[PDB]
Each structure stands twice: as C-alpha cells, then as structure tokens.
Symmetry: D2
Subunit: 493 residues, 4 copies
C-alpha cells in the first residue's frame, strides 16, 4: 500500500456540465472540511435549480437520437467505462487520499478496499454493456415480436457521503453501461471524490454532456433533479427521511422511476453452534467498519443464551482494540465520524441508551479534541425496546441482545421496518438455509459479513430500499423495455 | 358465440376476505348500474379502511412462513392458477355477460375477446410459477452465492373499470404465480366481474386468505391499501391523477414498491407507403375499440400529406359505420360509454374541439336517450395545439393531423408526457425499424394495432406508467431478490 | 391408490405413424412378457428400416413450413401438451398397470410415483412452449440482430425399458414443446406403455404425423432412426454400449445432433456426522429402488470408518426387509427384474463378487421360481478393485466401502468413467458445499437421494451422458438458434 | 494502418506446454511456406500422440481442484483474458503480418479486420467470465435446488488455417472464460499465428499449463486430442470430412462432447426489389473475401429473373476489379490461395464448371507464376445440377443462378446439406421476415453480408456444424451444469 504523503490537493471544486468545469450562478461556494481534524479542505461550489436545470439540459442533448452517445455501439460504451476504470486505478493513490481527507476514513480502507471496489464496479458494468439483450417472444399469431432493452433517459443520482466514490461508481456504471445519461448530485459532507472522478471520465473520452456532476447543498438540487420535467430516473442513496421526500416529489412531477436504497438496522444472529471466534471477528467488522457508517452495519447482534456472555466478552474486548486515531495514519483502525451532525447525533444515541440502562460495557464517549472521534462503544443487555434497538445509530456503537430459540430470534429481527442485510452465524446446514430464508433482508450473510461484491445484487427489502444495484439485476432499473410487434405473413415455429 | 339470454344475475356483491363473503362495517352498500340502459344492476357493498385493514390482516396470515400458501410448491401454485383459468372458461358465458351488463361492452368483445384474454393470462402466468429462477453468481472469493427470487408480501391492486376482469387477471396472475397474496380493490363503476371471479378462485381451492377482494368506493380503500403498514406492493391501473396520489402516499408510508400503469395519448403514424386499406381498418380499432376506453387508444393519427385526404375519407367513413346500439345486442359494434362521468366528459371534450375549430367530420354528439351513448366522432385538421391533441379523450372521438416528413412526425408524437403505445403503418423496412425505435412508447405496433398478447410485456414509458405487466418481465415486479452468500472452503470453477 | 384389478388389456401393439396404427411390413411381431410371472402379455409388432423410414417421412411432412404443426402458435403446442397430460392422468390407473405388468414394478411405484412424474413433465414442458425466447443482441454497427430459437426437425428417440413411460415423456415434452416432430422407438423389453400413450396423444388432437412411434426390436430401427438422412436429432437413453454405437453412426451419417444419457456407477458418501438414520433410509432407496434398475442407483456407498459398521448393520438390516413379491401385489416393495437378460446378468455379478471375496452380508441369490426375482443382496468390505465396484450391477445389489478421509472418498468416487449422480450425507455446511462441488456428477444430492424433479436439469458428466433433460436446459437441445442481422439505417441505443 | 515493413520474423516454432516451448519427440519439424510467394517461412515442429498426451497431462493438472486455475475467481479469469487481448493489440502490427505472410491475406484484411476481431472476442469473452450464472430452480418439496455452471475439463481445439488467429481466439475465449483448460492443435498450412499468441498468454500471466498448443500435422494429433481418455471436449473447425472423423472417434472413445463447425454452400438471394447497388457490392465480398476461403462464402447467388442480367453485369464487372497481387502489398484486394492443395483444387473446380458449360464470364485460370494466385472467376447460368452448385469451391469463384419466384428460390437454397449462412437482399418487410425464417441457416443476413460480430452466436445448421460460437450461447458448450439439491426443512416461497 503506497502512501500519498503528498499533501493532497483539491483539483476540482466546481460543477462539471458538458465536460467543462462551470461555477455557481449565485457564485455561492460551500466549504468542505477534514473531519479527522476539523480543518477546512477547500471551497467547492454550491449548485441550485439553475445548475441542475443547466445540466439536465446537457443530458437531453447527450441522449438524443443520432447523438454521439446514443449511436455509440454498446461495446464502445463498455470500452469507455473500462478506461475510466483504468484511469481511476492509475490515480488510485490520490483518489484514495481524497476520500480519507474528506470522508475521514482509514487509508487502508480507502485504498485496499474502497477504490478497488470502485474500479471493479466500473469494470463489471463495462462488460455488461454489450450483453443486455432483448427477447423474441414467440407470440401468438402470424406476428413477430421482440423486446428491446432501451435507455430510460437522463438519470439523477443523489449520493451519500459514507462511500463517496463507491456509490458514485455503483450508479454511473449501470447507467453509463445501459446507455443513460447522468446528472450526479454528490453530498455536502463530501464533494471532492466525485468531482475528481468527473475529470477522469473526460480523459476517458466520454462524450460531452453524458456525465454531469452538480455538486451543491442538498435541499436545493434535490427537489430539482428530482422534479425536473426532463429527468426520468432519480436514484437516491441516503437516509429514509430524504427518501420519502424524493419519491413523493417523483409522483408530484412525472411519475419518474424511483429507486431508493435507504438504510436499515441489520441483525446478526450468532448461534450456539457458531464458531464464536469467527462470529466475533465478523460481528466486529459488522458494527465498527467505517465507523458504523455503512447502511449494512450490525446494529443488533443477537446471541443465543448458551453463548451470550462469552460472546459479550470478546465482542467488547475487540471493541476497545479499535483505535480512534488518524484515518491518514497507519495502524489506525478507526477515524473521525464525519461531521458534528452525525457526530453529535452519535453521542446523543450513546446517551439515550445510557438513560435506558443499556449495559454500557465500553466507550460511551468521544476521544481526542479536534475532529470528530467517538469511542468504540458497546451496549450489552440491550432489549428490543431500547432506542438503540429501534433506530440507526449510524456510528460506532454495538448493541447485543440475548435469545433462547431460533423462532424467537428470527421473529425479533423481522420485527423492524427495514431489511438491507443480516448475518446468521451457524455451523448447521438446516439452520443456515431456514434462517437465511426466514430473515427478511435483501442480503443475508452466513458466517461472514460485509461481504458485498459487485456481481451480487444489493438493495433493501421493506423501507430499506427500492430496487437493486450491482448484479445483473441492477441493469434492470436503467433500461426500459420496448416491445415491437410486426405483422409477418406466415409464422413458422 | 353462445348468448346468455338468461337474465344475468349478480351472485356476488359482498367483500371476499378469508374465502368468505363478508359485508361492510358501515353497512354501506353502493349501487351499480347498467350504462347501456342506466338501470341499476344491484347493490354491491362499499368497503372502507376497516375492511381493507381487515383483509390486509388476512393476507399477512396467508403469507406467513409455513403457511399453507408459502410452503406450497410453486408447481402447485401453477396447478391452482390453471384451475381458476379452467373454471373461468367453464363459466365464460355468464362471466362474459356480467362484464357487458356492467361495463357496457359489445358481447362479441367480452366473449370472443375479453374473457379469452383473462383465461390466457392466468394460463400463462400459471406456467411461469415454477420457472422463476435465481442465479448462482460466480462471486469472487471462496464463497458461494446465489440469488433467490422470493415473494414480496401482500400486494394491493387498484383496478380500473374499462377492462373489469382482464386487469384483475393481469394482476392476480403474476402475483399468485410468484407467491404473493393479494388485496384487490375493484372499481366503482364496475364491481361485479371481480367479485364473481373471487368465487371461482375459492372453488379452485386457493388457500383461505390469499386473494381478498375489497369492493368499495375509491377514495376510501385507496389510501388504505396504499398506506397500510403491512402491504408492500401497490399496483394501480387507472388515470394519471390517482396515480401520483397513490405513489405519494407510498413514500409517505413505507416506500412500498409502486407499479402504476397510467394512461396516454398514443400516436398512429400512417405513411405514404402504407397500405391505406390496412391502416384504415386498424386505425379504426385503435380509436373506437371499447369506445376509446382503452389506454392504448389512437387519440392521434398522423397521416402524411400525400395521403392525408384519402385517409380522412375512409377513416370517417368507417367511423359512421359503427353502431351505437346495445352491447347486449348482436351486431352492435359500439355500446354505452360507462357513466355520466366519462359520458359528460366525453361530450365536453367533443365540444372543446368544436370551439377550437376542429374539423368535425362526423358525430359530435350523443345517440339515443337512456344509457350513455356518444356518436362515433371524428376531428380532421387537428393541430398539435388543439385540446383534443393534448388530453386523453378516453372515449369515442378521432383526431387526425397531417405531417410532411418522418422526422417531423416522430417529433410530434414524442412531444407528449406519455408513452403507452403507438402505430407506425409502413411498407418500408428501414422506416419500420427507425420509427419503431425513435418513438417513445412501451409498445409500438407496426402495421397493426391493439395487438397485445399476454406473453408480451406491456406498460408505459414516461408518465404513462411504471413497470410492466404480462411477459416474463411482469414477474419481476412481484419478486424480491435475496442474495445469500455462504463461506465455503475452497471454491473451484 | 386405486387398484386396477381389471385384468389389464393391451389395447395397442402396433406402429403409430400419421396418427394411425399401422403394422409391420415383414409382418413380424415380437412377443412381450410379464417378468413378474414370465407369462406372455401380448404380441406387439416389430419395426424395421422400412417402418422407421416410413415414419420419418411422416415427420418431415408434419415439420414442413406452413404445416399444421409449424404454424401452430406455441401457446397452442402447450395447450395440446397439457391435454395429453390431462388425458394420461385420467387413464392413470390403467396406464399405471400396463407399466407394472410389463416392467415388473411395484404398483405403488408406478402410480404414486411414475405416472405422476410422467404427467408433471408434460405439464412442465407445456408451460415452457411459449417462453423459449430469442435475444436481440446489441450488435456493433447500424445493424439489428436477433436470435431465433427454432425447431431442429425430426427427432429420433431411443428409450430404455426401466422407466417405460417417464423417459418417453421426458423426451416428447421438451420436443413437442419446442416444436420438433418425434419418431419414438420404444424398447423391446417393454413396448406397451408408449404405444398406449400414443393413442392418448391422438385424442389430444396432436396433428397427424407429429408423434410417430415405431415399436420394434433394437438393432434394426436403431441404426435407421440414427442414420436416416432426414432425422436431425437422435436422443438415446440406454446403456453406454449402444450409445457409442448411436453416436458413431451419427457422424457416419449427418453429424446429426446427439444427446445420449447413458448410465453410471454413483457414489453415496455417508460421513461421520451424518444422521445415520437418514443416511440409512435414503441409501436404501438409492440401491433398491426399482430393483436397482435406475441409472442413478447407489452402487457404491462409502461410509467413514467411524460409522462403517453401524451403517453396515442397518443397511443390510433394511435390505432383507425388502420383499421379492408381486409388483401387482400390495405391500410388495420389490418386483421381478425385467428379463433373463438382466436377470441372469444380475446373478452373475452377484457371483463375481462372491468370487472376489465380497462380504456377502445378505441375499446372493434369486427368490421364487417363475418370473425373475433376485434376493435383495448386500456386499460389505467392497474394495475399489472389486468388479462390483467397477461396473453397473444394474439390479438389486448393494456394495459398501470404507473411507477414512474426505479427500480420499471424493477421490475414490471421482475415479470412475461416469457421473450421473451422487449422495453426500452430511450435517456440516462446509462439507456439503465442497463435496458437492468436488464430486463429478451431474446431480449430487445432499442428505437425500433419488430426488429428481422435472424442473431440475438432469444428465450425466463424463461417459455418463451427453446434454441434459428436463429443466430449462433441456429445451436447449431441441432448439437451434438462427441469428438474423438486418441492415437498419441509424442504430440508436 | 501501420505497415510492418520489418521482415517478419518467426519467433515461435515449437510446442507450448506448461508455458514452456518444448520440441518434438521425434524431432520432426514441418515446414511452413509463404503462399503469396511459395518461399518457405520457417521450420515449425510437428507434434504427435506423445506431445498431445504430454500436453493433455498438463491440462488435467491445471484443471485440478485447488489448482491455481480453478480456485481463481472468475473475474480474474476475465482480468487475464483482457490482458491477452490488450497484449495482442499492442503487438497487433507483427501479429497481423504473421498471418499475411503465412495465410496469404491482404494486410488491410489482417489488420483492419482480423486482428481487431481476435481482440474483440477475447475482450467480449472476458466480460462473460463472471456472468455465467446458475439458477435456483424452485423445485417441489422442502428441498432447495440450484444449478451450477461448471467447467467441463480439458478442451481440445482443432483449428483451420483460413482464419489462423480468429478461430483460435473464438475457442480460447469461451473456454478460458468458463474455466476450462485448452490443448490447441493449429493447422499445418499455418502454425505461426497461434504459437505466437501462446507467448502473449504467458506474458499475460495465465497459469502454467492452461493453454497448451501442440502444433503438428493433422492426422496425428487429431486422433489423439480427439481420443485421449482425458480430454472431454473436442471442438473442431474445418471441413466436413475431418469432422465426421472427429465425431466418430468421439463416440469410440469417451462420448466426449463434440462441437464441430464444418462448412457450407451459402445462398445469396437478391430480389427484384433489392438495391442492386447494395446487393452487388455485398454479394461481392460474399464470394471474394479472403479468396472465398470463408466458410460463409456466397457460393450461390440466386437473382430474380427481372434483374438477372443486370446483376450479372456488375457482379462480374466488380469481379475483374479484384487484384491478384501481394497480400503484403497495399492496394491488393486479393492474395494467394493457400497451398497447392486448395490451389490445385480450386483450379480443378473451375475446370469442372467449364466442362459443365458454366457461363464462364471471367477468370477461369490462375494469375502470375510463383505462389498460388487464381483469377477472380465468375460462372453465370449456373444450374442447381452444376458441380459448382453442389460443392464448396472454397476459393475465388462465383456462381450465379436465376429464379422467378420466392418459393422456388427458398426451396432451391434449402435443398442442400448445409446451413452456415445466407443473404437475402430485399427492400420489403414481409419478404425479409419470411425468407429469413424459411431459410435454413444459422446466420441469415438481410441486405448485408459477412457481418459477423462476436456478440452474435454463430454456427451451422444441418451438416454445416454443431453447436454455436461467440454469443452468450457459445458459453453453453464449455460449461456443464451440476444440479445440487439439499434437503432443507420448511421451504417457503
């Protein structure tokens, strides 16, 4: 793992529309800060309805019949995606640093893990461009029918900071692969990662106006991209709240297609037969990976009575072993949160549990002064009524209940309004298959966790989301399906 | 074609929940009327939040793990669907009559066409139950992944009267096939068709509480089924208005999955090389089939200059040849509309065009006294600014513009906020393929129209709809996709 | 289970070509016998090159463009298949009896199991007729491509007696579904089952000359159907020997497509953690189901040392519990073999093991006088060098080795030239997935056996077979794939 | 187009097994010659049963469980393929030259066309490695089934010279993608192209013993690779003769899977409405591309009476316009044939037609002295009885019949024992679809020809071939399908 000791510089801070770095009409530029240190990083600009509208207009152009981007052979879309990927891999070092300096994330995590993931989505999605096929339904009659999988149109993507670049990639890969044009709105907590990738797309040679990024504060662009009368798909990844907002506006605009992957409270279910060693390590990443800021974080470990206490032991034991240090520092297994917003919130949640008599086995507070560091916390004896068990503590905090039966645990996990993921640790074949099905989640993990690959479709059940991403199924959201039926004369089977 | 001279009787007028004919809590029962005669047919009941909630509760029961309906082998779901189909075909005669007496529709159309269609969806969907398969993604790592296509849960279906039974079937086929449980809310203009089919499902042996129908006025159940905190999918087929309503509530409830197939203004594009004979006949069904009450009605025929007038001639010529008579009378090619609502509206639209200087080549008014009969109308010299060219005249009325180029016509059709369907009549290979793609519709028809088969996916682009129906793609809306990843030891390709 | 005490009558004994019961040119009619009693059942006829050629000619007619069978909408092919299925289910009783009286098979097995299976293939395959679709490859260039899945042509099917009707159905379902025409050659040991089904197809209304059956001795028709210069696919299910014969002639005729599902020696691998109870019962059906005359019979159980002896105990224990009685007698769990051929052979194999020092724990000989009954036998301490462990003892005989490691057992099973199936009994998740993959078989069974459903593709690896059957993959053998590429003008994505 | 004036050097002339350049056991090395000049190019070695057996042994090693090549994540197989592709593109210039110097082919054709094609297969096939998925059949019962698409094993590929590198790529792409190991036997007329690519695979980092090339004379290795008792798939691309040979040995060895794409006589069908301009140009490439040495060459143009003569005119007109010059010379549109073998044969065929009274409108003989150059020939007034119309004149020679009806022409084309391809030139929609279906070919071309892309499956009907290549369907030949069924407890839909 190379280290970019080079003081990371922010090369891009402006809006990218028509492959050109515009500015803000109001001339208003918001400020980005290093949450690991609280210092300011730079002054990216802030978009508004004008810029969204501006870019959306760019999109329709890119998407028009006989455009450069529509007549381009699909294989060539794939060829271009592969280049962005290859370009991102070349600049990996820096791009990895710009995520840490702005997302506050262990570098080993934003290099050995994140940027690699981003490249691999674009690589996968590239090889899926020329393989999205139609059908030739053997209809009845002397007619000949065939479905065509065709691009939707302009796609608006609202991303969340947690994974500044991975989700951008998870959304401009399936999109650009199927042939759609994207207006990307990156988050406020972190605008740098994307703006930079936009420059690499331009080097890749993507046509002018295919991928338009409109960095800028939420409320504003949101309603816009999500109510333009020219955008057809709004894909939002963020918290449930903003989500009902985006979907509402969707109806109240054009019935545009809406795929939203909100979050959830996911349950781990270690069982008497589990290899506690394994369950302990993986239950650990589950809650303390990226400082619990992954929508798939195990904010609810249920351990069977038999092995409740033991689990508790190592669980907290390893918890304290995390290091609230510098994401830009080696050996650091935990970084800042992200901002006073989540930061204060996290602490508040920690407090609530305390009030609720949570078994605060560790942490409970913050570490250090400048920046935003919370102390790897743990709450034993959590009950299904504790707030810590009813909400997304999106942050480092571990809650751990106790169950005595299989039916009870699967019921006590499915008693939520969420279903992004789950972990059943077991050493039994029958349990594995029953608890994997009885659980209501989009992705269940048996004896592992956080294992998400591009190939595998990912999304959420219930109010955890809408649609899927990655996979072969994530290219179903960005392609409409035109049936054409011709009147041939005699139709022979 | 047999004729049910037998005075059609309304056997069912009450709510079907848990395979039992309940009543209305308020004891309020709405009245259904024969639009062909305006006489009342019977007194079906009217549901409310209580009954919706009642039935939704029935559903969750039906859908529970180890339920009778979930442990049932998929093949058996198919076996049961095939029986409903076979039962519907046995009772065809009557069931055909109950649609005419309540939908006001030519019997030849509700027998030789509609009921046949209804059976064939259920037959198709039945043979799709045991063939919805997952995958075994060759993921990276020594892990083994597989996607499972699993039932969503309780599905709420809001149907429109136009096709009282076909859409019920288009929605309880893909659903019941994939294993979901349905709470069906039929329309007010016509509750009889469905309630009856519900009885046939019970004879078919469908478990108790799988298919619950809650007949009842719109506003009420609507918000309910569409905001229950236990229904997961709301599929609505109706007008755009109610649609943004259902989707907005969706977000403002559970982010439940929402597939809505609203309507559209569809364009026919007869061209200089077309076989006017063919184009004339098919452009005729396009607008005057089921009294223009098909969301795919050609409310916009564009004829190239060369053959504008000629087309106009036969077009109107055949128009007058339609017969505003008795849907329950043989030889009648047109029946009542449906109710003063659409009836008055239709006439109003007719008037507006008159005010707009539409070339009222025929009709313009109503025919007969009792019931709701409009005179097959036609409006030549329509312009893209005439109201008749900007709205769904959902009723018998034909509008006919004139275009001089291919680019112009395809632009003047794609200049709408709709895209359910279209008809390009041509005798040229290149046109066919370009105009079929350049057009923005879910279903384009070349040299034919109204040709919709179950096998072929159907839905709408733009604000014409959301998702698809029928097809192999219509079983993509009712199945969620669970990825399970196991940690095997060594993984060999 | 109803019982057809009615003295089963053989209604059909002649050749079915053009939906008509022809005879034999030579006038030669072979004799069929009841192996349960050795009495003769009737005198079916014997075909020859003339009759094969005769029927093949019928086929080409049925398959010609604009034929009745080619212009028939696929849905209608499915509709017709469903009727044969429904007809077979109506006559189930008798048809079940005609298999027992001729195959010598426990009635409970030829009713509660076999005929049910036959119906379910035809039901499945029926619902697969209208869903075999092409694609619309997004090729490069301004061209438009689409693959059409089209019928091969006349298909020749050589069946084996063991499952007289199930394999006929496994071959005239995928075929008739995809639209091909079949010339079926049934076995000598048992011609009745099929000839009868042919009559039911005719009642079903299948066109005249679609399904032509040419009953008749092997050698003769074989080379014919398999070297006609008008048949395109020869699907043979039988022993390896005849198979290399059919394939060699294939090349030496027309390179016709050849899918052959020969047999194999399949290995069960019970392990220390297995539920011996379960493993014992299922390992039992594995070898003594249908008198070991199933190509998937466990002629090789490997038990780990730990639980070797115990397994041996119950294994033989239950073995003796089988009853060499009357297949047409209730309570009989084992019937005759099939004919002196296999009968003598079986006994010979039994003897060879004895010579090899097999641990003859039970049986070893025949039971009763008339007919062909062998005594449920068992051979402990079998070694990988014993003939009983190198050949298909296609008959009741159980061999049981002992293994001490996982690697060793999976190696000692994969050391064959076969791979139809296998059974890994385990209670461990990791073993299950590794031994299921490490094993070289088309169908591996974990903790069960003989579980074969229509939906699941079935065939053999290595010299155990060629291609697959059932499944969605079994409609890949009977459909060729025509790519058509048109030169459209501008091609927009 | 860069030109490798650099005297092309033959870097590789030896056998590649275990990523090492072995030699020949007999020490026998065959000689390769430049057919454009008849001079010798170098002295490649000649393999035998020993070397085949040698390499096959290497393969099994590469394919073993836990091998480096089997545990490799599929994505990584794709990553490696992409590198070979990228490496081939880097060396393009030379590799293009080594095909011309040895295949005798216009450089513009072996650069701007061939090497590009080779790279694009490997690029496509690479992106298909991680997307070959199984299924999760919703079987009946409380069982859980899933099909696994798994590598077959060692694959033996016999290539033909015509496209020395493209077919190597068409066979080591689908193979290496699905995970199989290949023993490639290149042709005698041309061994250089492949041996070189083998070096690039090694640079790509493909494991040691995955791709083993055994250059060497036909008869020898043939029977070997095709009868090794360790190779499972033999894919041969060549003439029909050798094909029945390879398939017969297949049965007479292991029933190994056999996909053979032999050749054919393909028919063009220009029609009265065709754009003769277009039909003329494309009918030209059809027969004179790569000197008629493409298995898809239009050795049978049928022109409707109306426009027979006209077609004849330009057809021959452009024919003479071809240039029998130097494939390594710019502006040369035709090169040598390949060797006295085809060369003498070609001339013989030309003579036969002369004897048959063919309307020798042009050519008829050879051009120049050294090398192997035939004069672009044409034969008008060909009849369906002329030898030139019953055999593959695999070489430059054009035959042109006359037809008066559609039915007649489609019958006169389908009256062959072949079906690789066809060209229907038309300007009518109905013809296009009927003649495209009525024709019996794997690939029909409407208004174009020779248009073959990787994405599109390609193979032959009838005795023109077996199986398909490219496409998503070409990864169905190299993957077997293991069904695993587990006994879960309760199975909920």
């Amino acid at each position: 793992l190379p280290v970019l000791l080079t003081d990371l510089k922010i090369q891009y801070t402006k809006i990218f529309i028509n492959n050109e770095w515009h500015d803000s009409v109001s001339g208003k530029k918001f400020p980005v800060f290093n949450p690991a240190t609280e210092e300011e990083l730079c002054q990216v600009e802030e978009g508004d309805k004008e810029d969204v509208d501006k870019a959306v207009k760019a999109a329709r152009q890119a998407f028009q019949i006989g455009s450069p981007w529509r007549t381009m052979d699909a294989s060539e879309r794939g060829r271009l995606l592969y280049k962005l990927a290859d370009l991102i891999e070349r600049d990996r070092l820096l791009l990895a640093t710009m995520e840490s300096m702005n997302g506050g994330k262990l570098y080993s995590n934003a290099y050995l893990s994140d940027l690699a993931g981003c490249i691999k989505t674009l690589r996968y999605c590239a090889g899926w461009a020329d393989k999205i096929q139609g059908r030739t339904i053997p209809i009845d009659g002397n007619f000949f029918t065939y479905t065509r999988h065709e691009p939707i149109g302009v796609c608006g993507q609202i991303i969340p900071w947690n994974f500044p670049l991975v989700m951008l990639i998870w959304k401009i890969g399936p999109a650009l692969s199927c042939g759609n044009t994207v207006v990307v709105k990156p988050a406020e907590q972190t605008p740098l990662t994307a703006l930079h990738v936009a420059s690499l797309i331009k080097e890749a040679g993507f046509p002018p106006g295919v991928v338009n990024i409109v960095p800028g504060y939420g409320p504003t662009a949101g309603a816009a991209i999500s109510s333009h009368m020219d955008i057809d798909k709004v894909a939002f990844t963020g918290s449930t709240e903003v989500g009902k907002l985006i979907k509402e506006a969707a109806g109240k605009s054009n019935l545009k297609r809406v795929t939203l992957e909100l979050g959830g409270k996911s349950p781990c279910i270690v069982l008497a037969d589990a290899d506690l060693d394994n369950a302990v390590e993986f239950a650990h990443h589950g809650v303390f990976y990226h400082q619990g800021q992954c929508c798939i974080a195990a904010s609810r470990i249920f351990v069977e009575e038999s092995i409740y206490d033991e689990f508790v032991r190592r669980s907290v034991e390893r918890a304290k072993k995390y290091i609230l240090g510098n994401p830009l520092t080696p050996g650091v297994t935990q970084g800042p949160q992200i901002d006073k917003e989540q930061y204060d919130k996290i602490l508040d949640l920690i407090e609530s549990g305390k009030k609720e008599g949570a078994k605060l086995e560790c942490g409970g507070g913050p570490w250090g002064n400048k920046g935003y560091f919370v102390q790897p916390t743990v709450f034993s004896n959590v009950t299904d009524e504790m707030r810590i068990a009813k909400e997304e503590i999106f942050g480092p905090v571990q809650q751990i209940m106790k169950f005595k039966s299989l039916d009870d645990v699967i019921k006590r996990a499915n008693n939520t309004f969420y279903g992004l993921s789950a972990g059943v640790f077991t050493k039994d074949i029958d349990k594995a298959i029953t608890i994997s099905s009885a659980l209501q989640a989009g992705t269940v993990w048996v004896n592992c966790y956080g294992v998400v690959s591009a190939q595998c479709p990912f999304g959420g059940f219930k109010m955890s989301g809408n649609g899927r991403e990655l996979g072969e199924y994530g290219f179903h959201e960005y392609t409409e399906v035109k049936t054409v039926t011709v009147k041939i004369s005699q139709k022979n089977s």
